[PDB]
Amino acid sequence: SCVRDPSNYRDRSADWYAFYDERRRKEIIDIIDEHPEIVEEHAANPFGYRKHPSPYLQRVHNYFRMQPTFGRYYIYSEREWDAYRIATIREFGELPELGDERFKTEEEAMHAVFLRRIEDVRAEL
Amino acid sequence: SCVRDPSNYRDRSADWYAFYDERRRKEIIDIIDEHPEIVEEHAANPFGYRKHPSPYLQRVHNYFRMQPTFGRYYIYSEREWDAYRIATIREFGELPELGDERFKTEEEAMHAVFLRRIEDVRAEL
Amino acid sequence: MKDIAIRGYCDRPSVATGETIRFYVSANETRGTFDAELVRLIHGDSNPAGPGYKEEAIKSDLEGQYPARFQRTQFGSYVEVADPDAGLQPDGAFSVHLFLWSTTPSRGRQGIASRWNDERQSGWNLAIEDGRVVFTIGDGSGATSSVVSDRPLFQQIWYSITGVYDPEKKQLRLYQKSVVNRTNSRFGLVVPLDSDCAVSADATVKAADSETSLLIAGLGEAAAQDGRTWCIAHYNGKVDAPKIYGCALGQDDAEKLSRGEIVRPISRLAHWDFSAGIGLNGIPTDHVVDASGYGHHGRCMNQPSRGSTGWNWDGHEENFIHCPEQYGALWFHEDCLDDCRWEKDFEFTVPEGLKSDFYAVKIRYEDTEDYIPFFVLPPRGTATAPILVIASTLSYLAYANEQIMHKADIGQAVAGHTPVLNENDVELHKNLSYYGLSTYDGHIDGRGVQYTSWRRPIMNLRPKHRQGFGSIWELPADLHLIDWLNHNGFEYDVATEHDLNDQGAELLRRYKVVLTGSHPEYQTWANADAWEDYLADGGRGMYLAANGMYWIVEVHPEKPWVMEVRKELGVTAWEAPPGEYHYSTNGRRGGRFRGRARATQKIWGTGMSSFGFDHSGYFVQMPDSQDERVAWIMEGIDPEERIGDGGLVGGGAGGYELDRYDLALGTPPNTLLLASSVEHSVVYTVIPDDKAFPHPGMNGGEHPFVRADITYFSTANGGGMFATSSISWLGSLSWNDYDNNVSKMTKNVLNQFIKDEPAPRV
Amino acid sequence: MKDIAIRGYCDRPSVATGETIRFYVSANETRGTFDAELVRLIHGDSNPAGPGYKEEAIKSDLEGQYPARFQRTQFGSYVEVADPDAGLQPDGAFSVHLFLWSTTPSRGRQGIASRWNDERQSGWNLAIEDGRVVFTIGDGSGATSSVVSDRPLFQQIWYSITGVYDPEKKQLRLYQKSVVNRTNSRFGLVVPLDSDCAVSADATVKAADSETSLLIAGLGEAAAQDGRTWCIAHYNGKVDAPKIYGCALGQDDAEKLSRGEIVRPISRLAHWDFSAGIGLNGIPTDHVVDASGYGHHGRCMNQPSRGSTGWNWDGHEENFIHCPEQYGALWFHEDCLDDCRWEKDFEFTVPEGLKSDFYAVKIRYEDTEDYIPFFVLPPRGTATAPILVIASTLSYLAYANEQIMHKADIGQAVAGHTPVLNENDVELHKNLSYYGLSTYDGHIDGRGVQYTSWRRPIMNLRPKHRQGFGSIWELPADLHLIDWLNHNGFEYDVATEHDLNDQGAELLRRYKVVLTGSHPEYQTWANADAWEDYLADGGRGMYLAANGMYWIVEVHPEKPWVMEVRKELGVTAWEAPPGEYHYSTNGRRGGRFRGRARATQKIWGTGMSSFGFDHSGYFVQMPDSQDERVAWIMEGIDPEERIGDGGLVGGGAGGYELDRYDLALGTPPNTLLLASSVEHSVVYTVIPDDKAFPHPGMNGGEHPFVRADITYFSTANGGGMFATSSISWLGSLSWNDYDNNVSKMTKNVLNQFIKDEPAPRV
Ligand SMILES: [Fe+3]
Ligand SMILES: [Fe+3]
């Protein structure tokens, strides 16, 4: 009758997700700006071990930690307990992109990924 | 062989929940003291309408709002839009225990429950 | 504080022109007269920010005065077996055997099986008294003889019980053996259980004719005059395969009976197979077969849970229709109620000129008033308007006499504020046995209430009722649409979801457009088919709600006033029993529509997304807004405006519950997404399903699933489907004296759908 | 940047004295040699706070040098029919018909059904090319003739496809017809679907014998060598009732075929009923019956999902064993793998004096090393120690080659920190076709992986592996216990969960005590029965984990190396198809153990409560810890001391996953609660079930469910059960150089259980 070619139709929820993510990115950069102490809080104890994250630090974590895996950061163990790097997930069959610097501990690399995910969003605004 | 009379065997998860409620009550009162601004924040807008509760106020709500029904408070509409009272839930087949003061709006009655609930946890310490 | 003094109900939800509807009323004391009149319901919300309450008085044959009597209500479920010939009261030896599964062993005196007259203390009963099984017989002089168990019952353990009266030995004997397997009881074979015993006591009295009915899960109150044996001392739990023997059984016979053997079969006087009647369409009946061949058939009363795990259930098969021999149990609850069984006070035959619409019988009696709502159809097989409003009567039943804020601990947390209740709620808690429970409350057992009846006073059905989620709920909240339709002068018929279920798509096809209530959560499979077939062939719909068509529901074929629903998950902390997910009234799996490849998106365009009740949000227009194909939806609305910032339900047009666009769940490809909602707090929650596994931040403002999507798609032959995807949509229609975006949009669509031209294509 | 250059696997997880285990290796290219060696595993955690990596070389008949070769791995699931005599390449006219449900319609060239040699472009194939169904023939000259569909396939919509080669008309024909009903397809009857077409094209070549196997869900790559036909261009989605006729069909026949009729049955050359074989025990076979009666039987390769919804599935029955006629579909995935099918490089037969233990074959090749872990049992029918440690090999299979952090959006949210991955996680992502997926990942077409096989290199099995949740995970984590055992002089045996499923309670009964791994998440029903029976009759257990016995799992009776599991819910956003919950290998319902009335509390004393991985907490003692009855457990442990502050797994003895005490779920009444864990962040999450309905605050530090309970209960015949209820329990054993409360507590219990005397009563 009327619905013929599947390529004439797009998942129109992407319109919403693009707006939510834009509105939601601004919400995160503003939280960082008005509570700059959380960057120190994270660098001192990125695991929250025995000092749980603050509510505003947790709110930031909740956005970064739930992003799509493609283009996402993980930490790559080059030599465990000596050298860690920041990997970027690329398509299946590809190797990750490795950041240049090496970090000596897991905690140090976690904070580097935190700082970079923040710089990445500032760029998109 | 050994397990014979059902009254010899209490539900020992009550020992945990007693310890949990104690630690959790102290946590709340020390949240209210460390952030006294949240008592005013609730008075001004208990529904959070257009000004969502701050993270520390929500943590207090999360405790109060999940409490066992028996002995808990609700808001009785004595004369709707004119007089509201603080009702205390009792066993089935019983009237609720009713507070004395009457309130002109539900917003006022909701903050009255908030303050009384704080007063109640203080008294248990 | 103040006292509800009278309450009533009616026998059915809807009547067409020329048909009769009966009304039943009960006052606190039999004394005086009450007044009744007919009213057309218009607006229930008294919210001063809104247009206030509104009704219209209708001259009717029923208006007048009536004797005000108190009608005692038989509470609790059980099985009744008529025995006017005293066949089940032997004058010699006899024995009783059954399997039981007690869920409230310490909750007072409970009759497991009896032919007993409690007033005279005559007959015989097997009962739980002080947490122990007890076999008792009386002669009517007040004296009785009892044998009491050595081992108190463990909660939710299966036991085999054999009570024996051996007159040749002037002896009473009781045999108790536990029969737990890997899968039928609270705990398993690891615990070294010792709840077995065989005791005897002296029998000093003979068992006399109780002149009552034999009962399972209760005791006869007194001499059954009028043929009605009032049932008291209710049992909570399961009974499986109760039987009566006409001789005195011994130890080895109890041993064999505990392993499922039907010892000395010809000696049986009666033997009730609760599984007899299970077929591929379930066991949709209250009938109970007498497997002894002696004609002592039973009748289920107040709808106990049929299709329930039996003593021999081992877990290899979970659908009762495929293994009847392991589903021979009935689960009884002291707080069941499928019919108040009152005596009618007055009726009403719908006269000719009476418009199809929302109606109610207004009852005045002293310092109180009560409304008995019902619905008037157009003459059978006809339509009297172009618009059809579907009254969500199936959902009204699901929430019937809800006591969430009294039973659910997390009730207030889900509400996002302390709940504001009223006299109708205080009344449910004080006189529970006049009203019964909803499918959201748990039985005292802790099992979800899976049956809900229309033949009871449903207090949250009254138009002036306010509900604990923050404003109003279901029927009163649906009057938000009734008022808006009347205020704009639209002409409309009405029908119930019960009527849709009966007439199928043939009913919808009489209307250019069909409107939904504010929350059509519960629907039959036939209803889904009716919408699907109606829209596929030029029908035009308006899904002005959210969470619609979420739960598959069924109407009891024997008791059209009863609805069955079995939920995997509910507010109150009631256990969903492992092997009992299939509906007794049709044997189908039921449950979530989404789980049967029939998600709300497949039919109306959007589906359950999230819920939260602290307050409502508003819609911001999306890129499809400025599309010309839907210029007609947007005509009077500015591309920069918010939509629905303000309302009577939480202060916003998008709130309470939100449905979303989703291709994977069945949204038609040519759907356009006009606007989404914002300003939802952490109070808005997400039900974890296979697309949303639980993690931190699965709440409003932190997860992209928490929003409502206003959608539209065209169908073949000039049809079309418009959806707003928010429960609180209708609550925003009257804002600022009907001058707002929520009114403009709804009017634009409606005006377009009732035109004599195809709904715009895409 | 680092390059894993070689990998291997063994044919079975466990071997006893006298039995033979085969090893398979594949180097990146064929050159040089690798060294093989046998080592006993002891400790794999290189964490510097702990004792570091430990192993021991054992002399074995297998050590030596071996030629290193690359072994091609056949990837993706499909059906293969042997046809040496070219019966399915009829010399004359012929037609192909099937039902189709494409999940990746646009994912490049995919073969639906073929007898086709791609190197010579000979034979015939039905394929998706450019998003359209294409029927192609070839003569081996490189030229081909194609007829291309007019309507591109819609994703997850059911189509009836008919391909016709008509040499009389020198014509190819294609009949595409959409057969969507209310319940079988992505969307429903509302959408006006124009996706039907009949197209013809000229036939300018004869169809030649391709000298390959006939395939469903793929194309033959080249002329079969030695009988192996390689399958390329893997199709994703379902196929139903594919059949081949020995004549050309017309519009009429394709019409009837699309409605289910079996037109001209006498002319069928072959017809595959994928549902033939379904019984009450399911369909535990790869066999595919040729219902035409011609003997052209096929064989499933790489375990496509059997017992799957067909084109005619209407939703009345959801269990394939009770309606096979509606479950005639196979679900194919390009990333299925049940067997690498490599050629063995060497083998090993357990000699007499080899202790039962954790073992691996260590492989050195250039500057890489790999470990092929397996397990050695005592001589059949005997035990060689008083302690038995169960290797959680069912759970190893479930997490086999997990790639959560690469595929799950919320992977890091669940973890509570950016995950730390290693060389093994990079290899999985570059060369997925060598390794395959776990049950925690999704298939490329967004459906859960329900089969997992041991006959593949499983990288997270290697001891030096570290997993993204924070430290180590399964087998490496279990080596924490293996190190504590060997360090403290305990003599122990080892058996896999696969062995428990084989031998039953007879195996457990040979030991005074049986120890659990760190995470026995996956168990067979027979494993439950064995634990229950063992513990009920004097056995003694130590549940040193959490989330144990959560998922019901089945071992493929035809392929003991495959395990099946179907889950309602997973971290990856994969769908759980509506009518496909029942297991194809036994027909039972499977799923959560709690859902079949066998909650873990019923057997081990505690059951799943929550999970979270940012770090672990410690245990604070409870009142039952100072009960004199358990003084033997609390030896050198002061009542004020914290238990387990510090550890190699999140820094605490209680975290990662937490189990709790719950009477309602089966905890024995006589259970004592010695301690509960604290210090859990909001990262710790609760899974919504009937006990806890989702609401704000359902997370660590805010809900009383989020804790771990240390319990003990006695059983008959001097048995008893001890649970620590925390995955990270074994991670704290080695803390502070083995001087900690978690070591003393575990030792206290272990020394008591291995005593020739009854576990303390209660
Ligand atoms: Fe609901
Ligand atoms: Fe898991």
Author numbering:
A (entry chain B), B (entry chain D): 7 to 131
C (entry chain C), D (entry chain A): 1 to 762
Text of the article:
Certain bacterial species from genera such as Paracoccus, Pseudomonas, and Alcaligenes have evolved to use DMF as a sole carbon and nitrogen source for growth via degradation by a dimethylformamidase (DMFase). We show that DMFase from Paracoccus sp. strain DMF is a halophilic and thermostable enzyme comprising a multimeric complex of the α2β2 or (α2β2)2 type.
The overall structure from both these techniques is similar. The exact nature of the metal ion as Fe was confirmed by X‐ray fluorescence spectroscopy at the synchrotron. The mononuclear Fe atom is tetra‐coordinated with the protein. It is coordinated to two phenolates of tyrosine residues (Y399 and Y440 serve as monodentate ligands), and a glutamic acid carboxylate side chain (E521 serves as a bidentate ligand).
